[PDB]
Symmetry: C3
């Protein structure tokens, strides 16, 4: 048995949360299975892009609340939230783009995981909430990723009232990149995944890292940083292949 | 009597800007009255949430320009602005959440006050402007709040041109949490206020303070801050109550 | 012979990207011409606002890939991107507001430029994209302005996949200020520019500089800085003229 299942094919790794009976709860065990599937062979050139999806009608309900009862000890509580944050940080610092594919409810740390991904596609019936407050545990952790996804006015009404937002509201305020009918979720997600897998890994990997490095900077420093990265991109073989191909009106053949 | 009236029933403090004849101008006296009502008993457990509302069709027109003439002197000017900012800071840092209920025009510092609230619910007839430029006074202090509410491209047309946006546009760009027809403004606002009031104050309070602490950090620091906060929240009696109530399928009883 | 044309009338400078046969590509020579038109007489009181527009159906395609080929050397490559970054910074640090008036496609460094302006107005047929990746050159430079324009989830789909967003979407997500038919575009941009031109230069210029200074700060620092700028504004002659004029129910006559 294992709470995530993973499969990689034509550069696309799909990590499926596979405990629908437990509403794909981010138990310490599930988090570690997830961490493991994300890190596995992360620098292989054969890996181009990660999709994180879920089995069933709940993407994830968040943490296992039994693990956060008094008797488990504060050290164990610390471990749950730290392992979780470590995973969000792995995703952010990963060499490849990570995409959330959502087809139903993501709540609390489940909503955190969607928000932490580079891209997020959902079906129109999905919904997102941070309701820890209803069980006496403010979604503070989730609030980190939600604060960087949506406006404060949206985030604080989510966090203080525990009420969920629709997929269309998520799309409007920045939590998601795309929304489509359920029937098309897989075609739409694979459209983005395949496009990514069809590009140069080292160009896309430098693109991602650079983007998160410049993001918190002032404008001048953000531009020093990125300019210098364009110049480095140009010195890659795939950089010159890409330009040459364009100038010669033909398809680029990436070596990575 | 005073330019702000404050009542508190059942967790919910309603503070009304009650000077419609002067468009709820944020004169120094309006600001000190409001500060007073915000701060009063701020640590009392009977207070769970604050709603800031306004009497008349102008939520607030902003500062009183008569206070900003050359005759008052630069120190008076400094006091109006330092006092206005203190207030906004006191809301930011308040132990409980603060909600704006808006039924009309919020311009200049009045728009700033809307944007400084944690949650803001307006009627569909409402509008928001930063027209200081038109009276030679760039809306620099309102731009602080507006720059943290809306995209730059929206904030900057507002500030450079002084033209209002509608409540619809305000919702689309993040200045407001909710917009409803005016007939529904009070129930929509009380729906949120009551919800907040039915939760655990110390958990909501920890929640709000932590949120504002993590917001400006690098992501790693933000997770260090918040992970520790969660762990401390579990140590609260109401943390464990809410958890236990949930796993026993009942309503929780907060201390 | 210059790849930009600039004309100034009633305080409004229009700088027009005028190399449509090369889709207004941001070559080193276009960037220097553009830089020159922006900086020229920048402290003159007769200048009140800048509009950057373009000839023809592409606004700009971004940099000239020729570049950018290995043979040009890294110094030349660093020059293209450093000059582009300086242009961006000159727009931000300018004493007057700069409006982008966009009518068609704006791509890579072209999109950068748009998202670098203080206000942007676009015809409804306009569209925006950061397709570097397709030519092995990630839009790292453009992702600076884009990260500060739209939500991460929108920016990162755009960067990793290279698909345009339309002007409606750039409006919703914060790329643009206004979207109007192509037939309202000149008048709509002129409404903003004339309004600005009708205000006090010193007051607007103070506000613009103050705005970008407070923008990164913690909230306490932001209010310290702005409230001190409020007080400085009131010590300006046009500060007092505007306030008096309001209180006397008349129209302010600015001195600047």
């Amino acid at each position: 048995p294992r709470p995530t299942s993973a499969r990689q094919l034509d550069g696309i790794r799909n990590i499926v949360l596979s405990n629908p009976k437990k509403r794909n709860t981010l138990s310490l065990a599930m988090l570690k299975s997830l961490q493991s599937d994300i890190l596995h062979d992360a620098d292989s050139n054969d890996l181009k892009v990660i999709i994180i999806s879920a089995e069933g009608p709940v993407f994830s309900s968040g943490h296992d609340l039994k693990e956060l009862t008094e008797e488990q000890g504060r050290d164990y509580h610390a471990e749950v939230f730290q392992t979780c944050s470590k995973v969000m940080m792995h995703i952010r610092n990963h060499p490849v783009p990570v995409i959330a594919m959502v087809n139903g409810l993501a709540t609390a740390a489940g909503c955190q995981l969607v928000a932490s991904c580079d891209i997020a596609v959902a079906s129109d019936k999905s919904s997102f909430a941070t309701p820890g407050v209803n069980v006496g545990l403010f979604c503070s952790t989730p609030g980190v990723a939600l604060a960087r996804a949506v406006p404060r006015k949206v985030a604080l009404e989510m966090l203080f009232t525990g009420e969920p937002i629709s997929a269309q509201e998520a799309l409007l305020h920045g939590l998601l990149s795309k929304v489509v009918p359920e029937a098309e979720l897989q075609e739409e997600t694979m459209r983005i995944a395949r496009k990514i897998a069809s590009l140069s890994r080292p160009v896309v990997s430098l693109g991602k890292a650079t983007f998160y490095k410049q993001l918190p900077q002032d404008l001048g420093t953000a531009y020093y940083l990125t300019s210098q990265a364009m110049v480095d991109n140009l010195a890659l073989r795939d950089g010159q292949e890409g330009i040459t191909a364009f100038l010669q009106k033909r398809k680029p053949v990436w070596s990575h």
